[PDB]
Amino acid sequence: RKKRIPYSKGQLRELEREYAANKFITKDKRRKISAATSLSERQITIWFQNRRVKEKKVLAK
DNA sequence: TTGTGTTTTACGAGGTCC
DNA sequence: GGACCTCGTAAAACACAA
Numbered sequence: 001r002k003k004r005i006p007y008s009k010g011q012l013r014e015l016e017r018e019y020a021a022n023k024f025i026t027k028d029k030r031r032k033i034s035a036a037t038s039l040s041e042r043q044i045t046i047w048f049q050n051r052r053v054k055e056k057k058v059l060a061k
Numbered sequence: 062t063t064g065t066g067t068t069t070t071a072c073g074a075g076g077t078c079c
Numbered sequence: 080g081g082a083c084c085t086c087g088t089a090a091a092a093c094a095c096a097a
Binding site for chain 1: 082083084085086089090091092093
């Protein structure tokens with residue numbers, strides 16, 4: 001399930017970089033992420049969802 | 062070098078919008 | 080009729096006090 005495989009350094013750099021661009025992934029960007037990073041379109045979608053969860057948690061507060 | 066507590070992937074139950 | 084969302088959740092992997 002199915003089953004957790006941590007993302008690499010260069011991958012996360014690409015992810016967090018285009019996340020800093022704006023919180024929500026566009027269809028266009030997801031293509032070129034998926035190529036540059038070798039993750040599936042679904043993974044990126046899920047990661048972006050999980051990124052915003054983490055950002056919400058920053059409300060300590 | 063270990064626990065054990067927090068972070069990181071990955072999903073299914075609910076939802077909006079179209 | 081799917082594409083995508085915030086969310087609770089599990090569980091591997093992480094990051095520290097010891």
